Design a protein around this motif. Sequence first.
Motif, PDB file in Angstrom:
ATOM      1  N   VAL A  14       0.827  -1.208   0.000  1.00 28.39           N
ATOM      2  CA  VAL A  14       0.000   0.000   0.000  1.00 28.39           C
ATOM      3  C   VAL A  14       0.858   1.254   0.000  1.00 28.39           C
ATOM      4  CG1 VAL A  14      -0.264   0.623   2.425  1.00 28.39           C
ATOM      5  CG2 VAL A  14      -2.194   0.883   0.848  1.00 28.39           C
ATOM      6  N   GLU A  15       2.066   1.137   0.546  1.00 27.53           N
ATOM      7  CA  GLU A  15       3.012   2.244   0.606  1.00 27.53           C
ATOM      8  C   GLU A  15       3.257   2.716  -0.811  1.00 27.53           C
ATOM      9  OE1 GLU A  15       6.352   0.191   2.759  1.00 27.53           O
ATOM     10  OE2 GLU A  15       4.702  -1.263   2.718  1.00 27.53           O
ATOM     11  N   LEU A  16       4.239   2.121  -1.478  1.00 31.25           N
ATOM     12  CA  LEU A  16       4.522   2.512  -2.844  1.00 31.25           C
ATOM     13  C   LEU A  16       3.216   2.835  -3.518  1.00 31.25           C
ATOM     14  CD1 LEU A  16       5.786   3.046  -5.423  1.00 31.25           C
ATOM     15  CD2 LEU A  16       6.275   0.616  -5.718  1.00 31.25           C
ATOM     16  N   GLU A  17       2.194   2.028  -3.253  1.00 27.31           N
ATOM     17  CA  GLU A  17       0.889   2.285  -3.841  1.00 27.31           C
ATOM     18  C   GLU A  17       0.511   3.757  -3.773  1.00 27.31           C
ATOM     19  OE1 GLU A  17      -2.421  -0.325  -2.733  1.00 27.31           O
ATOM     20  OE2 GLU A  17      -0.882  -1.673  -1.927  1.00 27.31           O
ATOM     21  N   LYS A  18       0.037   4.185  -2.612  1.00 27.46           N
ATOM     22  CA  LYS A  18      -0.376   5.564  -2.466  1.00 27.46           C
ATOM     23  C   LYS A  18       0.761   6.549  -2.724  1.00 27.46           C
ATOM     24  CE  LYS A  18      -1.000   4.120   2.287  1.00 27.46           C
ATOM     25  NZ  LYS A  18       0.432   3.726   2.289  1.00 27.46           N
ATOM     26  N   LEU A  19       2.019   6.143  -2.544  1.00 28.15           N
ATOM     27  CA  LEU A  19       3.138   7.060  -2.811  1.00 28.15           C
ATOM     28  C   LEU A  19       3.118   7.523  -4.246  1.00 28.15           C
ATOM     29  CD1 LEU A  19       5.954   6.884  -4.542  1.00 28.15           C
ATOM     30  CD2 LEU A  19       5.540   8.671  -2.847  1.00 28.15           C
ATOM     31  N   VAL A  20       3.213   6.553  -5.143  1.00 31.84           N
ATOM     32  CA  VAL A  20       3.214   6.844  -6.553  1.00 31.84           C
ATOM     33  C   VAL A  20       1.878   7.453  -6.903  1.00 31.84           C
ATOM     34  CG1 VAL A  20       2.429   4.533  -7.040  1.00 31.84           C
ATOM     35  CG2 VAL A  20       3.383   5.918  -8.876  1.00 31.84           C
ATOM     36  N   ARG A  21       0.788   6.972  -6.323  1.00 34.74           N
ATOM     37  CA  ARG A  21      -0.497   7.579  -6.648  1.00 34.74           C
ATOM     38  C   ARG A  21      -0.516   9.089  -6.367  1.00 34.74           C
ATOM     39  NH1 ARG A  21      -1.841   4.174 -10.492  1.00 34.74           N
ATOM     40  NH2 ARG A  21      -2.189   2.040  -9.725  1.00 34.74           N
ATOM     41  N   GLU A  22      -0.267   9.467  -5.124  1.00 32.47           N
ATOM     42  CA  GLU A  22      -0.253  10.847  -4.688  1.00 32.47           C
ATOM     43  C   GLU A  22       0.720  11.647  -5.493  1.00 32.47           C
ATOM     44  OE1 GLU A  22      -2.656  10.009  -4.007  1.00 32.47           O
ATOM     45  OE2 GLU A  22      -2.180   8.407  -2.592  1.00 32.47           O
ATOM     46  N   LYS A  23       1.939  11.145  -5.613  1.00 31.82           N
ATOM     47  CA  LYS A  23       2.966  11.818  -6.401  1.00 31.82           C
ATOM     48  C   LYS A  23       2.392  12.120  -7.792  1.00 31.82           C
ATOM     49  CE  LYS A  23       6.855  10.378  -7.139  1.00 31.82           C
ATOM     50  NZ  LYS A  23       6.898  11.821  -7.516  1.00 31.82           N
ATOM     51  N   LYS A  24       1.807  11.091  -8.390  1.00 34.15           N
ATOM     52  CA  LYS A  24       1.179  11.186  -9.689  1.00 34.15           C
ATOM     53  C   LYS A  24       0.251  12.390  -9.639  1.00 34.15           C
ATOM     54  CE  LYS A  24       1.641   6.515 -11.501  1.00 34.15           C
ATOM     55  NZ  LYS A  24       0.952   5.553 -12.419  1.00 34.15           N
ATOM     56  N   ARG A  25      -0.677  12.385  -8.691  1.00 36.26           N
ATOM     57  CA  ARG A  25      -1.582  13.506  -8.515  1.00 36.26           C
ATOM     58  C   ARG A  25      -0.749  14.802  -8.620  1.00 36.26           C
ATOM     59  NH1 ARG A  25      -3.928  12.987  -4.571  1.00 36.26           N
ATOM     60  NH2 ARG A  25      -5.064  14.972  -4.732  1.00 36.26           N
ATOM     61  N   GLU A  26       0.344  14.875  -7.869  1.00 34.88           N
ATOM     62  CA  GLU A  26       1.292  15.996  -7.874  1.00 34.88           C
ATOM     63  C   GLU A  26       1.548  16.420  -9.338  1.00 34.88           C
ATOM     64  OE1 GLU A  26       5.661  15.014  -7.046  1.00 34.88           O
ATOM     65  OE2 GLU A  26       5.215  15.854  -5.073  1.00 34.88           O
ATOM     66  N   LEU A  27       2.084  15.498 -10.123  1.00 33.40           N
ATOM     67  CA  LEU A  27       2.328  15.849 -11.502  1.00 33.40           C
ATOM     68  C   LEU A  27       1.049  16.367 -12.140  1.00 33.40           C
ATOM     69  CD1 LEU A  27       4.484  13.893 -10.497  1.00 33.40           C
ATOM     70  CD2 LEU A  27       5.064  13.568 -12.877  1.00 33.40           C
ATOM     71  N   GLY A  37       2.909  29.257 -13.341  1.00 33.83           N
ATOM     72  CA  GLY A  37       4.318  29.427 -13.013  1.00 33.83           C
ATOM     73  C   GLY A  37       5.112  29.130 -14.263  1.00 33.83           C
ATOM     74  N   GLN A  38       5.155  27.849 -14.619  1.00 38.04           N
ATOM     75  CA  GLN A  38       5.797  27.384 -15.846  1.00 38.04           C
ATOM     76  C   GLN A  38       7.331  27.260 -15.936  1.00 38.04           C
ATOM     77  OE1 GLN A  38       2.106  29.282 -18.624  1.00 38.04           O
ATOM     78  NE2 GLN A  38       3.921  30.528 -18.123  1.00 38.04           N
ATOM     79  N   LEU A  39       7.962  28.428 -15.973  1.00 33.43           N
ATOM     80  CA  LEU A  39       9.402  28.572 -16.099  1.00 33.43           C
ATOM     81  C   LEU A  39      10.256  27.604 -15.277  1.00 33.43           C
ATOM     82  CD1 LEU A  39       9.352  32.392 -16.439  1.00 33.43           C
ATOM     83  CD2 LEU A  39       8.525  30.594 -17.909  1.00 33.43           C
ATOM     84  N   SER A  40      10.220  27.693 -13.944  1.00 34.66           N
ATOM     85  CA  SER A  40      11.003  26.778 -13.088  1.00 34.66           C
ATOM     86  C   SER A  40      10.302  25.413 -12.966  1.00 34.66           C
ATOM     87  CB  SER A  40      11.241  27.387 -11.684  1.00 34.66           C
ATOM     88  OG  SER A  40      10.121  27.272 -10.820  1.00 34.66           O
ATOM     89  N   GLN A  41       9.044  25.379 -13.410  1.00 34.45           N
ATOM     90  CA  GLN A  41       8.235  24.169 -13.394  1.00 34.45           C
ATOM     91  C   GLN A  41       8.967  23.156 -14.232  1.00 34.45           C
ATOM     92  OE1 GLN A  41       3.999  24.418 -14.307  1.00 34.45           O
ATOM     93  NE2 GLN A  41       3.798  26.406 -13.289  1.00 34.45           N
ATOM     94  N   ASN A  42       9.070  23.424 -15.532  1.00 35.96           N
ATOM     95  CA  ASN A  42       9.787  22.502 -16.431  1.00 35.96           C
ATOM     96  C   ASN A  42      10.114  21.147 -15.777  1.00 35.96           C
ATOM     97  OD1 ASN A  42      11.317  23.659 -19.147  1.00 35.96           O
ATOM     98  ND2 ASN A  42      10.785  25.313 -17.732  1.00 35.96           N
ATOM     99  N   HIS A  43      11.113  21.246 -14.923  1.00 36.28           N
ATOM    100  CA  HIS A  43      11.646  20.117 -14.214  1.00 36.28           C
ATOM    101  C   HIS A  43      10.682  19.348 -13.370  1.00 36.28           C
ATOM    102  CE1 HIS A  43      14.827  21.960 -16.112  1.00 36.28           C
ATOM    103  NE2 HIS A  43      14.602  23.081 -15.453  1.00 36.28           N
ATOM    104  N   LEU A  48       9.698  14.732 -12.323  1.00 35.72           N
ATOM    105  CA  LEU A  48       8.593  14.118 -11.591  1.00 35.72           C
ATOM    106  C   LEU A  48       8.106  12.888 -12.320  1.00 35.72           C
ATOM    107  CD1 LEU A  48       8.385  16.078  -9.309  1.00 35.72           C
ATOM    108  CD2 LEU A  48       6.074  16.626 -10.067  1.00 35.72           C
ATOM    109  N   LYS A  49       7.960  13.028 -13.638  1.00 41.79           N
ATOM    110  CA  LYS A  49       7.548  11.883 -14.433  1.00 41.79           C
ATOM    111  C   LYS A  49       8.587  10.783 -14.270  1.00 41.79           C
ATOM    112  CE  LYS A  49       4.739  11.481 -17.564  1.00 41.79           C
ATOM    113  NZ  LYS A  49       3.765  11.482 -18.682  1.00 41.79           N
ATOM    114  N   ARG A  50       9.856  11.093 -14.533  1.00 39.59           N
ATOM    115  CA  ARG A  50      10.907  10.079 -14.385  1.00 39.59           C
ATOM    116  C   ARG A  50      10.818   9.355 -13.021  1.00 39.59           C
ATOM    117  NH1 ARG A  50      12.937  12.665 -18.951  1.00 39.59           N
ATOM    118  NH2 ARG A  50      12.712  10.894 -20.384  1.00 39.59           N
ATOM    119  N   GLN A  51      10.600  10.141 -11.973  1.00 42.48           N
ATOM    120  CA  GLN A  51      10.449   9.698 -10.593  1.00 42.48           C
ATOM    121  C   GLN A  51       9.355   8.655 -10.483  1.00 42.48           C
ATOM    122  OE1 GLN A  51      11.140  14.365  -8.975  1.00 42.48           O
ATOM    123  NE2 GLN A  51       9.157  13.313  -8.792  1.00 42.48           N
ATOM    124  N   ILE A  52       8.117   9.084 -10.709  1.00 40.09           N
ATOM    125  CA  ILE A  52       7.006   8.157 -10.603  1.00 40.09           C
ATOM    126  C   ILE A  52       7.290   6.902 -11.417  1.00 40.09           C
ATOM    127  CG2 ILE A  52       4.581   7.861 -10.925  1.00 40.09           C
ATOM    128  CD1 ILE A  52       4.293  10.795 -10.529  1.00 40.09           C
TER     129      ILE A  52
END
Length: 67
Positions: A14-27, A37-43, A48-52
């Motif tokens: 469930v850990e990784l589960e909700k971790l990647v889920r929430e993170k995903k939400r983040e993205l 914002g945009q400019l510094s967002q880029n990354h 973030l994608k690479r991460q998830i």
Amino acid sequence: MRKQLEEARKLSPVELEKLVREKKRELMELRFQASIGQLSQNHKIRDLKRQIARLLTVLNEKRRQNA
RNA sequence: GGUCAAGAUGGUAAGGGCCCACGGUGGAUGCCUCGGCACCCGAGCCGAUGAAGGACGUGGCUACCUGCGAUAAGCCAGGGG
């Protein structure tokens, strides 16, 4: 964030589960950002994608180990 | 110097003809290649762990040539630097 590679190592079901889920939400948040914002967002986006992505690489590794 | 009869020749281009100068459109082309082609050696099996072969995707901001495909200018681990 090789360190993140670490946390990864750390969590499990469930850990990784909700971790990647929430993170995903983040993205998602990012997706939204597509005009603010945009400019510094880029990354936040690329990385973030690479991460998830990793998140998934792991789940695979672990539960794969399983079944 | 002036008048008349006679004779003979001259230049005068709208355009055109040969020559020279100077342009333009046309690419010959001399050479020059990440491209062929020829011979010889190396190599010779792909596929349901649904392949060869493509459809629609993703690159912050991209029609397209690219690589991936929904974890998509890529995540993982080891080999190399």
